[PDB]
């Protein structure tokens, strides 16, 4: 054989060289660094009003406004500072799995099992919120979506692919393929020039938004990936999985850097988020709690067990003042 | 201490709370039924017979049912079955006419599954005009050697029904309601109505501890 032999020998030799040139793990270089202690955080605000499971939640860029979607087919925009409901958007499909808040603050994006990314305009002259656009073309369910700008958004899908759209035209500018399983989460880089996405094929990968080419792929995993997020500098990313482990990868070494697992943890991770410093990795599990992990020591730096149901979504403000956590118990909680 | 504007903000929040509560109530009087099964298992036939994700809202005897057909999701990754908790029932459609082994493994999957531990399932063999003619070709041993009964419709059909029921290893909590009557008769919905009524009554009793 030549094509099979070529593929096998390539993969083997690249991976062997990567392993050989690997110097040390994340923990090996930070052993001298002192820990953070116990991250004891209190529920400062509790957002009541959602009457079903909360699936997605995204902070606004002002670090004061929130948007959350519930299984009840409702997208609530909250004023976290006073828990003062700013907007209530009735979604067209009640099966919504992702939320995004536009960096400018004029738009919010949502969607789910309807295979459509709906974009709603907040700053209208009529005093209400309306459906600005609907992006269609994905075949599998809508896993995640993130605004690049006021007119350019990126989406992941069960279509085993991703899509870069142009909101004005409504057509998908680029289609990113290469995954073999359902793509469950995408994170946008701070400079909005790349992104990373994990799929049900138990693999993650870095995709370039401009060239539409598959820049890199990362493996070393047992189960599917349900959550992914960038380090605040866009030089790494953490993934969460049904494996009951969270893994931190670097996009330059091309190798997994650190593992975030504990023996007593038996269920998967639903959501992943980073501290403003990238010093605390917050992970929502199916154990009805949220764990704070020392991103450099891999130890559990605390817990947020104020919810009596799985912590479906996490989120950290842009200023790092508070953490929003949404669970299936129909409550969002802000912690500080 | 509130300013002239914060008091109006609080008023707006309270009005939104009222609207959210009054719409959640409207959403809680609705019976959610998942529709599952293999292709050409009558899923298309049932949705028409019934009075991306395709939602069919129909009212029967004052009960408003949202039947969700998710056969459109071409990724068989069950990464959304957890979204269907709380559904009153799963309507599983299978066709007598080794596809049967495929259906059996699917039924075992949906029943055994933990998101659906207690969710009673409404098994269906809707059609009955082509389920008998093809039993004269050969008995239920084309791919099922174990059967040793009469190669007639009632005997074989009853055997298949029982073998699929046997895949329930958790009757303690959930129940299976099986249907055979021909799809042509419009009783597919009535049987669904009875089964959901039974499931709801038992959910209520199992909630006050009486059960």
């Amino acid at each position, epitope marked *: 054989d030549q094509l099979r032999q070529e593929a096998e020998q390539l993969k083997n030799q690249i991976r062997d060289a990567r392993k050989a040139c690997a110097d040390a793990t994340l923990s090996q270089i930070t052993n001298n660094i002192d820990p953070v202690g116990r991250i004891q955080m209190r529920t400062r605000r509790t957002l009541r009003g959602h009457l079903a499971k909360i699936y997605a939640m995204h902070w606004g860029t*002002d670090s004061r406004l929130l948007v959350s979607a519930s299984q009840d087919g409702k997208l609530i925009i909250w004023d976290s500072y006073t828990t003062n409901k700013v907007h209530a958007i009735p979604l067209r499909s009640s099966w919504v799995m992702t939320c995004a808040y536009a960096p400018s603050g004029n738009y919010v994006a949502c969607g789910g099992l309807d295979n459509i990314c709906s974009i709603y305009n907040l700053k209208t002259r009529e*005093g209400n919120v309306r459906v600005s656009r609907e992006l269609a073309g994905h075949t599998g369910y809508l896993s995640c979506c993130r605004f690049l700008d006021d007119n350019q958004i990126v989406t992941s899908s069960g279509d085993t692919t991703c899509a870069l759209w142009d909101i004005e035209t409504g057509q998908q500018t680029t289609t990113f393929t290469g995954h073999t399983g359902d793509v469950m989460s995408l994170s946008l880089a701070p400079d909005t020039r790349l992104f990373v996405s994990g799929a049900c094929d138990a693999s993650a990968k870095l995709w370039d938004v401009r060239e539409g080419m598959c820049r890199q792929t990362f493996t070393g995993h047992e189960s599917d990936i349900n959550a992914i997020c960038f380090f605040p500098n866009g030089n790494a990313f953490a993934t969460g999985s049904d494996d009951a482990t969270c893994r931190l990868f670097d996009l330059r070494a091309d190798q997994e850097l650190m593992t975030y697992s504990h023996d007593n943890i038996i269920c998967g991770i639903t959501s992943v988020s980073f501290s403003k410093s990238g010093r605390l990795l917050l992970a929502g599990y199916d154990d009805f709690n949220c764990n704070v992990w020392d991103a450099l020591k891999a130890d559990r730096a605390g817990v947020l067990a104020g919810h009596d149901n799985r912590v479906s979504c996490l989120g950290v403000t842009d200023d790092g003042m508070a953490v929003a956590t949404g669970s299936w118990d129909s409550f969002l909680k802000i912690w500080n | 201490t509130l300013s002239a504007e914060d008091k*109006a903000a609080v008023e707006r929040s309270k009005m939104i709370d009222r609207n959210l509560r009054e719409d959640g109530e409207k959403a809680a009087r609705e019976v959610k039924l998942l529709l599952l099964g293999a292709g050409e298992s009558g899923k298309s036939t049932i949705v028409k017979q019934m009075k991306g994700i395709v939602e069919t809202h129909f009212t029967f005897k004052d009960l408003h049912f949202k039947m969700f057909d998710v056969g459109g999701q071409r990724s068989e990754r069950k990464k959304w079955i957890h979204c269907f908790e709380g559904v009153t029932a799963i309507i599983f459609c299978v066709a007598l006419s080794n596809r049967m082994h495929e259906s059996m493994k699917l039924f075992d999957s949906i029943c055994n599954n933990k998101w659906f531990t207690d969710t009673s399932i409404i098994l269906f063999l809707n059609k009955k005009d082509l389920f008998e003619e093809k039993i004269k070709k050969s008995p239920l041993t084309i791919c099922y050697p174990e059967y040793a009964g009469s190669n007639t419709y009632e005997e074989a059909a009853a055997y298949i029904q029982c073998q699929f029921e046997d895949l329930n290893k958790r009757k303690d909590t959930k129940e299976i309601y099986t249907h055979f009557t021909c799809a042509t008769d419009t009783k597919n919905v009535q049987f669904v109505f009875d089964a959901v009524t039974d499931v709801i009554i038992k959910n209520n009793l199992k909630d006050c501890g009486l059960f």
Partner: single-chain antibody
Amino acid sequence: VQLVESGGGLVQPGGSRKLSCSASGFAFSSFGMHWVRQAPEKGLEWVAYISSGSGTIYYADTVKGRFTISRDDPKNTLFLQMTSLRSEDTAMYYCVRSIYYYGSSPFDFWGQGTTLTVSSSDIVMTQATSSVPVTPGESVSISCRSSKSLLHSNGNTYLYWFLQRPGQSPQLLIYRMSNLASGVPDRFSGSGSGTAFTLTISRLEAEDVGVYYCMQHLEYPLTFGAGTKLEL
């Protein structure tokens, strides 16, 4: 967005009437509608306020116990029923929309007004002048003073800035402090501290002539200024 008033006319003292604000082109139902008035070449004067949901109704001391404000959300129509009308109730009355949430502009749109003629504690804000000659291209600086500190504990200095052009209803320039409204040219700017407040205009144009008004929203009743005129 469109707010059209009606019901004006000439009324003898001791009569009663009902000004109507037949709004159009926006969600009037979720909007807190205010009633303002301007007496003949004397200035703007707040009349009343009704919040979204009719949960809060405020009246000016002049119309406190006399006149009422009614909402009709399903019909998108504000109302002001005036019972006893003295000779001081002669003025052109404006219907204004106002929405209150974090970051909102609470006086974005004013109506065109309707005229009413009649036969024959509160924060005080003063406008230093009433007429200022200027030519196009020369920057202008209007200013006004207030009694208390409009700066609340929120950090919001609830001072507003409207401009009324000749022969047309007032238009909102600023809504807290330099926070330019939607559709206003970027040249207009605001600033101030506590009591002294200023509005700066760079590269003045022919459409910038009129009367500048500074109002406060920290406490009710809402009090406007006299009105600083710009000449050319």
